[PDB]
Design an enzyme around this catalytic site. Structure first.
Site, PDB file in Angstrom:
ATOM      1  N   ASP A 167       9.452  -4.288 -15.181  1.00  0.00           N
ATOM      2  CA  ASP A 167       8.964  -4.061 -13.821  1.00  0.00           C
ATOM      3  C   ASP A 167       9.181  -2.610 -13.407  1.00  0.00           C
ATOM      4  O   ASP A 167       9.501  -2.315 -12.249  1.00  0.00           O
ATOM      5  CB  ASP A 167       9.661  -5.034 -12.862  1.00  0.00           C
ATOM      6  CG  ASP A 167       8.948  -5.218 -11.546  1.00  0.00           C
ATOM      7  OD1 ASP A 167       7.713  -5.073 -11.474  1.00  0.00           O
ATOM      8  OD2 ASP A 167       9.650  -5.534 -10.556  1.00  0.00           O
TER       9      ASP A 167
ATOM     10  N   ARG B 174       8.257   2.119  -6.908  1.00  0.00           N
ATOM     11  CA  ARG B 174       8.945   1.253  -5.971  1.00  0.00           C
ATOM     12  C   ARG B 174      10.246   0.655  -6.519  1.00  0.00           C
ATOM     13  O   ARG B 174      11.004   0.180  -5.763  1.00  0.00           O
ATOM     14  CB  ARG B 174       8.050   0.123  -5.492  1.00  0.00           C
ATOM     15  CG  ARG B 174       7.689  -0.831  -6.587  1.00  0.00           C
ATOM     16  CD  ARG B 174       6.703  -1.929  -6.144  1.00  0.00           C
ATOM     17  NE  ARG B 174       6.526  -2.748  -7.294  1.00  0.00           N
ATOM     18  CZ  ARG B 174       5.694  -2.509  -8.296  1.00  0.00           C
ATOM     19  NH1 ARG B 174       4.685  -1.498  -8.307  1.00  0.00           N
ATOM     20  NH2 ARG B 174       5.876  -3.315  -9.254  1.00  0.00           N
ATOM     21  N   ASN B 175      10.496   0.662  -7.773  1.00  0.00           N
ATOM     22  CA  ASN B 175      11.728   0.108  -8.322  1.00  0.00           C
ATOM     23  C   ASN B 175      12.696   1.182  -8.798  1.00  0.00           C
ATOM     24  O   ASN B 175      13.628   0.892  -9.559  1.00  0.00           O
ATOM     25  CB  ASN B 175      11.398  -0.920  -9.403  1.00  0.00           C
ATOM     26  CG  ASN B 175      10.693  -2.114  -8.823  1.00  0.00           C
ATOM     27  OD1 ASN B 175      11.051  -2.580  -7.739  1.00  0.00           O
ATOM     28  ND2 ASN B 175       9.659  -2.589  -9.501  1.00  0.00           N
TER      29      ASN B 175
ATOM     30  N   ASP C  65      16.289  -2.671  -9.594  1.00  0.00           N
ATOM     31  CA  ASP C  65      15.463  -3.858  -9.839  1.00  0.00           C
ATOM     32  C   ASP C  65      15.824  -4.571 -11.147  1.00  0.00           C
ATOM     33  O   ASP C  65      14.969  -4.765 -12.019  1.00  0.00           O
ATOM     34  CB  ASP C  65      13.991  -3.433  -9.765  1.00  0.00           C
ATOM     35  CG  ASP C  65      13.009  -4.564  -9.970  1.00  0.00           C
ATOM     36  OD1 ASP C  65      13.237  -5.679  -9.452  1.00  0.00           O
ATOM     37  OD2 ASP C  65      11.973  -4.307 -10.634  1.00  0.00           O
TER      38      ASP C  65
HETATM   39  N1  LIG Z   1      20.925   0.965  -3.315  1.00  0.00           N
HETATM   40  C1  LIG Z   1      20.005   1.166  -2.361  1.00  0.00           C
HETATM   41  N2  LIG Z   1      20.030   2.274  -1.614  1.00  0.00           N
HETATM   42  C2  LIG Z   1      19.056   2.452  -0.630  1.00  0.00           C
HETATM   43  N3  LIG Z   1      18.090   1.460  -0.463  1.00  0.00           N
HETATM   44  C3  LIG Z   1      18.119   0.372  -1.246  1.00  0.00           C
HETATM   45  C4  LIG Z   1      19.069   0.219  -2.184  1.00  0.00           C
HETATM   46  N4  LIG Z   1      18.847  -0.949  -2.794  1.00  0.00           N
HETATM   47  C5  LIG Z   1      17.772  -1.509  -2.242  1.00  0.00           C
HETATM   48  N5  LIG Z   1      17.326  -0.701  -1.285  1.00  0.00           N
HETATM   49  C6  LIG Z   1      16.120  -0.979  -0.451  1.00  0.00           C
HETATM   50  O1  LIG Z   1      16.191  -2.301   0.093  1.00  0.00           O
HETATM   51  C7  LIG Z   1      14.810  -2.742   0.273  1.00  0.00           C
HETATM   52  C8  LIG Z   1      14.635  -4.017  -0.560  1.00  0.00           C
HETATM   53  O2  LIG Z   1      15.532  -4.051  -1.673  1.00  0.00           O
HETATM   54  P1  LIG Z   1      14.927  -4.228  -3.161  1.00  0.00           P
HETATM   55  O3  LIG Z   1      15.941  -3.839  -4.167  1.00  0.00           O
HETATM   56  O4  LIG Z   1      13.606  -3.555  -3.165  1.00  0.00           O
HETATM   57  O5  LIG Z   1      14.775  -5.825  -3.264  1.00  0.00           O
HETATM   58  P2  LIG Z   1      13.372  -6.550  -3.623  1.00  0.00           P
HETATM   59  O6  LIG Z   1      13.703  -7.976  -3.845  1.00  0.00           O
HETATM   60  O7  LIG Z   1      12.711  -5.788  -4.709  1.00  0.00           O
HETATM   61  N6  LIG Z   1      12.579  -6.384  -2.140  1.00  0.00           N
HETATM   62  P3  LIG Z   1      10.954  -5.953  -2.128  1.00  0.00           P
HETATM   63  O8  LIG Z   1      10.984  -4.758  -2.970  1.00  0.00           O
HETATM   64  O9  LIG Z   1      10.870  -5.744  -0.674  1.00  0.00           O
HETATM   65  O10 LIG Z   1      10.425  -7.203  -2.697  1.00  0.00           O
HETATM   66  C9  LIG Z   1      13.957  -1.588  -0.253  1.00  0.00           C
HETATM   67  O11 LIG Z   1      13.858  -0.572   0.741  1.00  0.00           O
HETATM   68  C10 LIG Z   1      14.871  -1.083  -1.308  1.00  0.00           C
HETATM   69  O12 LIG Z   1      14.435   0.205  -1.764  1.00  0.00           O
END
Ligand SMILES: Nc1ncnc2c1ncn2[C@@H]1O[C@H](COP(=O)(O)OP(=O)(O)NP(=O)(O)O)[C@@H](O)[C@H]1O
Length: 267
Positions: free
Chosen positions: A129, A133-134, A147
């Site tokens: 993945d 975005r990840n 991710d």
């Molecule tokens: N360590 C971090 N520092 C800053 N932002 C974070 C961090 N981890 C996650 N985020 C943010 O939190 C939000 C969602 O977390 P994420 O890791 O993307 O989970 P996800 O299940 O992939 N959610 P989505 O991407 O919305 O389906 C996004 O803005 C991420 O970029």
């Protein structure tokens, strides 16, 4: 994994949501952290996936891989606590900072991502993945792969779409898309083509065109990541080596690939 007591964790603001619920920014005892929770009623599979994600991240120690501060597993709700990345997701970051970086900074981003991916592949972890975005970005412009755990068509290699073959070489295809995302400041790959149209174009042999202002060497490298034959793609070690050498001799980045304009302006 390191166990953290709930009294050391202060959730401050919701920053997103995912398969497990809410994601917060907060503080850990004093450092900023991201906090993912798993609330009561979670299923066995959810618990396995949640602690499995923490378990995967706890096995890694690399500059370009998000660091796990620890977990709350002995108390409810359970939590995964990671280093806070001040600039958030790379895709949104690029789109909100369009044109603000040098080519050398953009290529340095890609070298960091590639070093993280080389580490993952050598640890026998297939990401599946990989996409801007990840990837998360800190206040030093360091890009770190995020991710983790136990997927859109236009980031995915043909063999993974066609027959579910996910390997480090399909991750290399995705990395090529990430290169294109970075060099375009977060353009949507293939623009408005539908998923079926993207796959048809790839099978017909078409590939994404060069970004504007893109070093020739960088476009050549992304094109090699998109070889249909998986065995012909570079390995992440090759990618890191090439990017390192381009950065060490930065005049190599001044030679640009020709951009195909979509529009004619006659004056
Ligand atoms: N360590 C971090 N520092 C800053 N932002 C974070 C961090 N981890 C996650 N985020 C943010 O939190 C939000 C969602 O977390 P994420 O890791 O993307 O989970 P996800 O299940 O992939 N959610 P989505 O991407 O919305 O389906 C996004 O803005 C991420 O970029």
């Amino acid at each position: 994994t390191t166990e953290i007591h709930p009294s050391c964790v202060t959730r401050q603001k919701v920053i997103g949501a995912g398969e497990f619920g809410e994601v917060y920014k907060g503080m850990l005892k004093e450092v900023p952290v991201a906090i993912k929770t798993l609330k009561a009623g979670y299923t066995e599979k959810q618990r396995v996936d949640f602690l499995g994600e923490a378990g995967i991240m706890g096995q890694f120690s690399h500059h370009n891989i998000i660091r796990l501060e620890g977990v709350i597993s002995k108390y409810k709700p359970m939590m995964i606590i990671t280093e806070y990345m001040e600039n958030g997701a790379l895709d949104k970051f690029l789109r909100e900072k369009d044109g603000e970086f040098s080519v050398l900074q953009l290529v340095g981003m890609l070298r960091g991502i590639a070093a993280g991916m080389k580490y993952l592949a050598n640890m026998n972890y297939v990401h599946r993945d990989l996409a801007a975005r990840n990837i998360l970005v800190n206040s030093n412009l360091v890009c770190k792969v995020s991710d983790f755990g136990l997927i859109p068509i236009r980031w995915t290699a043909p063999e993974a779409i066609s027959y579910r073959k996910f390997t480090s070489a399909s991750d290399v295809w995705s990395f090529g898309i990430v290169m294109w995302e970075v060099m375009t400041y977060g353009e949507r790959p293939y623009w408005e083509l539908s998923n079926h149209e993207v796959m048809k174009a790839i099978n017909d042999g078409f590939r994404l065109p060069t970004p504007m202002d893109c070093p020739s060497a960088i476009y050549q490298l992304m094109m090699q990541c998109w070889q249909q034959e998986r065995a012909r793609r570079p390995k992440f070690a090759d990618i890191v080596s090439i990017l390192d050498k381009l950065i060490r001799a930065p005049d190599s980045l001044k030679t640009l690939a020709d951009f195909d304009p979509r529009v004619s302006i006659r004056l």
